[model samples]
Target: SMVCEVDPELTEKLRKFRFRKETDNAAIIMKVDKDRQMVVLEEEFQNISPEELKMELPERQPRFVVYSYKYVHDDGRVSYPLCFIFSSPVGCKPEQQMMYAGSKNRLVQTAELTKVFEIRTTDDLTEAWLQEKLSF
Candidate 1:
């Protein structure tokens, strides 16, 4: 599995919540690395603002949010959620632009840690096959 082993203390904190598959009802293990980088193949309960949601799909193209925990070697970790708006026009695969409304200092300071990719999707993409694709 691509899930990394987490420290006992960190794992304990995560165990307080249920970690289920993002697109299904199956249970899966979630871990946070020593550097506080998290790998969770599950759904998050946090809700995005309406304005943010609107900004995500301005052109009605395929888009995804990659939320990650940015960890600094010395400083603490902060959640850095970025939206990648993709434009699939013409013969190209897809072009993406990162929309970051979070702190720039925090992102630059925590560049050394690993980032687990969590692909967010709407209710329409919540299929069993999609869940399997996002697991690893």
Candidate 2:
């Protein structure tokens, strides 16, 4: 019987690939609009290293690396695999921070957003028609 909660094969392979260092994931930049109700979220200039993110920060604060998963539905639906780590560090006050968090979390967790990210393969999941069928 399979006694372990995890898959034995998965656990066996995971041990070999240790996360000794960081991964070369995409970097991002975020800034709050002072005296406003909007925040800017965009990909960092890919022309340089992620280490440059700190200096690129608005007030030279530390950047973070966070991740989120997608929930692909069976019938017809899905979720987004977003990397929400561009949030600023100590830039907004307690109130502003809460507001920012609420807005960001609310948008992503909304039902409309979840359905918006669904990867419904209209025709076929193939490299040939991938770009032609999908819209940005």
Candidate 3:
């Protein structure tokens, strides 16, 4: 298992990513910069749906995502909750998986996200699945 340090610039980017003033769903993908031994941003999406986000995941690579989406309460009030998702699919290299898993909590703490979840497979990352996770 390898422990990767987070890039300071990435920490700033994650701060900005968390406070974006968007109501529509948004997601940012991050990966470990192998040579740099740091975690950095891979890509970002705005006004995206869960289906579209699922398409961005790699089949055999782990990734970290910071997502914000519109949620409605029983009282009819709407709010966007920041969610942190770790996508560590099966069949990925063990070294890569451990690096990502080790760095996950640091990134989550930096982002100050309360809703955290993991997915073993990409296809299960759907709207219904997210809602189910958030429902409790």
Candidate 4:
């Protein structure tokens, strides 16, 4: 019912961000389904139009959100990070969703077990800010 495609470049970036810290590292997994042709993530949300999605992928394919991870504090609080994987469709906006897959404190501690989060577009949020926040 679901298919998986792994983007090496995207995966590397996410891993770097998740382990950039010495205490905490947060990450998420994003899967794009080519069959049903929709993005699915951890949260319960409605199907968004291609115009609402913003991920850059290879030519001729639909983008979907499979998973995500948010940075959690030592006290168990979560912080929003910027590094993400997305699909870029023609006539569609540049939409990118963040990742949540692993931890900095413990390399094996992955965000895969945790819930996934998805963001349609960065209209309200700029990419610059998104990158800066996730750096530290």
> Best TM-score goes to which candidate?
3
- Who is ahead in TM-score, 3 or 4? 3
Candidate 3 lDDT tens digits, 1-136: 4667887887887888777786878888899998887899899887778888898899799999998877777789887777899999999999889989888888899888888999999988998888778766
lDDT of 2 by residue, 39-101 (tens): 443344423332353345444232222222232445567543333343334544565555544
Each prediction's whole-model lDDT (CA): 0.28, 0.34, 0.86, 0.33
Q: What is candidate 4's lDDT per residue for 13-110, written digit by digit as tens? A: 44554434433222232443334333233221223222233322223332333222244566887664433333323434323222212111121222
Give all TM-scores, in the order shown: 0.20, 0.35, 0.89, 0.26
Q: Is candidate 1 or candidate 2 better by TM-score?
A: 2
Off by over 4 Å in 2: 1-26, 34-36, 41-44, 59-82, 86-92, 107-136
In model 3, how many backbone clashes occur? 0
Query: What total of clashing residue pairs does each candidate reach?
Result: 0, 0, 0, 21
Task: Give Cα distance to truth, residue 75, candidate 4, Å.
Answer: 20
The number of clashing residue pairs in model 4 is 21
